[PDB]
Write an enzyme that holds these catalytic residues in place. Sequence first.
Site, PDB file in Angstrom:
ATOM      1  N   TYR A  53       0.565  -8.337   5.225  1.00 33.75           N
ATOM      2  CA  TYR A  53      -0.300  -9.201   6.022  1.00 33.75           C
ATOM      3  C   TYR A  53       0.432  -9.925   7.172  1.00 33.75           C
ATOM      4  CZ  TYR A  53      -4.414  -8.827   2.764  1.00 33.75           C
ATOM      5  OH  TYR A  53      -5.533  -8.458   2.001  1.00 33.75           O
ATOM      6  N   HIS A  55       0.848  -1.193   0.000  1.00 36.75           N
ATOM      7  CA  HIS A  55       0.000   0.000   0.000  1.00 36.75           C
ATOM      8  C   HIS A  55       0.884   1.244   0.000  1.00 36.75           C
ATOM      9  CE1 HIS A  55      -3.318  -2.774   1.251  1.00 36.75           C
ATOM     10  NE2 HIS A  55      -3.905  -2.009   0.341  1.00 36.75           N
TER      11      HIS A  55
HETATM   12  C1  LIG Z   1      -5.691  -5.818  -0.683  1.00 38.53           C
HETATM   13  C2  LIG Z   1      -6.622  -6.915  -1.229  1.00 38.53           C
HETATM   14  C3  LIG Z   1      -8.109  -6.699  -1.259  1.00 38.53           C
HETATM   15  N1  LIG Z   1      -6.107  -7.323  -2.581  1.00 38.53           N
HETATM   16  N2  LIG Z   1      -5.778  -6.439  -3.608  1.00 38.53           N
HETATM   17  C4  LIG Z   1      -5.290  -7.199  -4.611  1.00 38.53           C
HETATM   18  C5  LIG Z   1      -5.283  -8.533  -4.177  1.00 38.53           C
HETATM   19  C6  LIG Z   1      -4.837  -9.794  -4.744  1.00 38.53           C
HETATM   20  O1  LIG Z   1      -4.350  -9.878  -5.911  1.00 38.53           O
HETATM   21  N3  LIG Z   1      -4.989 -10.868  -3.941  1.00 38.53           N
HETATM   22  C7  LIG Z   1      -5.527 -10.828  -2.665  1.00 38.53           C
HETATM   23  C8  LIG Z   1      -5.685 -12.051  -1.804  1.00 38.53           C
HETATM   24  C9  LIG Z   1      -7.063 -12.132  -1.156  1.00 38.53           C
HETATM   25  N4  LIG Z   1      -6.789 -12.803   0.119  1.00 38.53           N
HETATM   26  C10 LIG Z   1      -7.537 -12.420   1.312  1.00 38.53           C
HETATM   27  C11 LIG Z   1      -8.958 -11.927   1.088  1.00 38.53           C
HETATM   28  C12 LIG Z   1      -9.911 -12.688   0.434  1.00 38.53           C
HETATM   29  C13 LIG Z   1     -11.185 -12.189   0.258  1.00 38.53           C
HETATM   30  C14 LIG Z   1     -11.559 -10.948   0.725  1.00 38.53           C
HETATM   31  C15 LIG Z   1     -10.614 -10.168   1.345  1.00 38.53           C
HETATM   32  C16 LIG Z   1      -9.320 -10.648   1.535  1.00 38.53           C
HETATM   33  C17 LIG Z   1      -5.369 -12.906   0.410  1.00 38.53           C
HETATM   34  C18 LIG Z   1      -4.717 -12.053  -0.649  1.00 38.53           C
HETATM   35  C19 LIG Z   1      -3.282 -12.476  -0.973  1.00 38.53           C
HETATM   36  N5  LIG Z   1      -5.929  -9.685  -2.124  1.00 38.53           N
HETATM   37  C20 LIG Z   1      -5.786  -8.577  -2.889  1.00 38.53           C
HETATM   38 MG   LIG Z   2      -7.435   0.590   0.668  1.00 36.33          MG
HETATM   39 ZN   LIG Z   3      -5.845   0.164  -2.716  1.00 35.13          ZN
END
Ligand SMILES: CC(C)n1ncc2c(=O)[nH]c([C@@H]3CN(Cc4ccccc4)C[C@H]3C)nc21
Ligand SMILES: [Mg+2]
Ligand SMILES: [Zn+2]
Lengths: 328, 328
Positions: B247, B75
């Site tokens: 994370y 971020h």
């Molecule tokens: C920051 C989050 C929302 N984000 N932005 C891009 C991506 C991505 O390419 N992968 C993931 C994965 C989603 N996983 C956790 C999760 C699942 C569903 C809803 C919210 C979080 C783990 C990430 C590596 N998060 C992303």
């Molecule tokens: Mg945000």
């Molecule tokens: Zn963002």
Amino acid sequence: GSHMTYPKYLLSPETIEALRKPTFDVWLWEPNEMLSCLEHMYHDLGLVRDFSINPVTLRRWLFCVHDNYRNNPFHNFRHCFCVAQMMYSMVWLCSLQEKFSQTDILILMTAAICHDLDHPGYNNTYQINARTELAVRYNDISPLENHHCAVAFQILAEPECNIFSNIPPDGFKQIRQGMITLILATDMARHAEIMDSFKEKMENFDYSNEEHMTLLKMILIKCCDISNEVRPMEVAEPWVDCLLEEYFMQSDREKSEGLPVAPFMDRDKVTKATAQIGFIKFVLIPMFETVTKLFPMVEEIMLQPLWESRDRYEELKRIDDAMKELQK
Amino acid sequence: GSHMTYPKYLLSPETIEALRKPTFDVWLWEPNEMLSCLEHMYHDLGLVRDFSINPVTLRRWLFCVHDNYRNNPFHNFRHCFCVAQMMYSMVWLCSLQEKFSQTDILILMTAAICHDLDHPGYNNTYQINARTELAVRYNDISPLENHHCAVAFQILAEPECNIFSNIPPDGFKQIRQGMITLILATDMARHAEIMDSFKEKMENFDYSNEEHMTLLKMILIKCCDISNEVRPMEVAEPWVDCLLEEYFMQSDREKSEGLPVAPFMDRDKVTKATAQIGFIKFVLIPMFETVTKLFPMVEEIMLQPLWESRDRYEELKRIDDAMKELQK
Ligand SMILES: CC(C)n1ncc2c(=O)[nH]c([C@@H]3CN(Cc4ccccc4)C[C@H]3C)nc21
Ligand SMILES: [Mg+2]
Ligand SMILES: [Zn+2]
Ligand SMILES: CC(C)n1ncc2c(=O)[nH]c([C@@H]3CN(Cc4ccccc4)C[C@H]3C)nc21
Ligand SMILES: [Mg+2]
Ligand SMILES: [Zn+2]
């Protein structure tokens, strides 16, 4: 009626009795006596007992609350006391302990006390139009009410004021969420929305539906907040003048800074009589009408005075009008 | 291609054309080059022209925005550049200038740039559970997104940075309201809700219905925000490690402070492949499918690369599974 005299902060038996009714004359009391009243409400409602509140903490907390109310003509500590005292009245009047958990009563009371913390005496429309630090902070979303609320929990995070320190984390989180909802619900920009949602639930009300109950508590805190006119005329009427003081302060400033003035803050458009007739007929009566379907005793104790108020302002208006007939 | 060499901050012709496609390698560029890219988008989209933005103010503003991004693994200012660069790509790809006013294009871009301002590298759940100043300030309601949005307007209120200074107050109000709605829409806690409202409008979409369009812009920003996997695999994949780094920083800290840990952040439970498989399948793909109904060119340009990613990751996971099975 007592054999010796006591300091003012030791509430007399008659005061304790009077405090349960919406006829309580809120003007008679200094801050210290008001603080004592509030304290007594916490004990008398069983909230000290049921939430294991340190009785000195309750006092330190209320003193801290008091200190974080500003000396505005209207949005001051005496106003928070009115709101709290009316809520208390309503618990008795509507037998709210039959219907609501002790946690719900704690939320109602604590939100009532906290709901205008650190109010600047200029409203959300001022904040938003003037692009104040608060409006910017809160993204034009209920800026004041969000602040009232944050100040509330800032105060509760001071360990000597933390009336919730003997409450388990889940209860804390439950109370926190309810208080936020309630204090946010006092933004009058959401009045018609909240009334519509409520009335919708009132098509078939369910006391065991949490959602119904949340709307009912939002309506209760809204009732208490704008209820000055429910009070005896001699108690009610001075509050309108304090509010107009605040509002004139704001519209002066708005004129001077080139910002839009609300007609109801315009010295040349508002009158007390006409402002109150409108607010009584179109906001207060209808709200209390819906509540009266659930709590029938509300009609006699709160609608009647409102009818009486409306009628008396109508009289006053006939006279303001004649005065203006002498002035051009 | 040119007869002499120019500083990196003077974008070559080739970089300028390449900047318009989702295929742009965001990893190649230094901050000053990314800043020149963003500047170019404002000129190229006609926003400098249609809103009388002082070209120097535009750069001061961009530099200030850059400064108020933190050096987080995910971020960070490069992420902001991605989100904006994807938005800009979608403008061209979806011929958004046919469908949207310039005000709406402005809102979309400016929100994309600003949407993660001053991110601390710990999500809303950490803020809330840890009861941080942000959580208490924002009453546990999207505290980070509220904050990102507040910081955006703190920046714009600095007169040297106010790219909106030649816009009348009615236009400013409209842009601000739109940006607030879009930045707050990036809170993933709200994803299913926003998707559902979108889908129900999508039953009979109406480009002339302001509520339909608001939802559409909400989805667009949400698309650009989580869009890394739409990018070519070599551009897309290093982002996953960056995010996991952030994370893991969070779960380690929660673990140490005795706070709850989300399984998807726990270094013991998380696989890269399994993380990505579900997110692509159940968040990214369904979201881009609903967009494709309005913008059928999206299928080939954004869905196809998501399908490949899903397939690639489902394969990696088989290889993981065959390693685990092979050992324990
Ligand atoms: C920051 C989050 C929302 N984000 N932005 C891009 C991506 C991505 O390419 N992968 C993931 C994965 C989603 N996983 C956790 C999760 C699942 C569903 C809803 C919210 C979080 C783990 C990430 C590596 N998060 C992303
Ligand atoms: Mg945000
Ligand atoms: Zn963002
Ligand atoms: C703080 C405001 C909402 N408030 N609280 C109590 C009262 C009151 O007794 N009168 C008024 C007047 C009504 N205002 C005009 C208005 C009419 C209808 C709906 C909303 C506002 C002007 C106040 C002097 N405001 C109150
Ligand atoms: Mg208020
Ligand atoms: Zn109030």
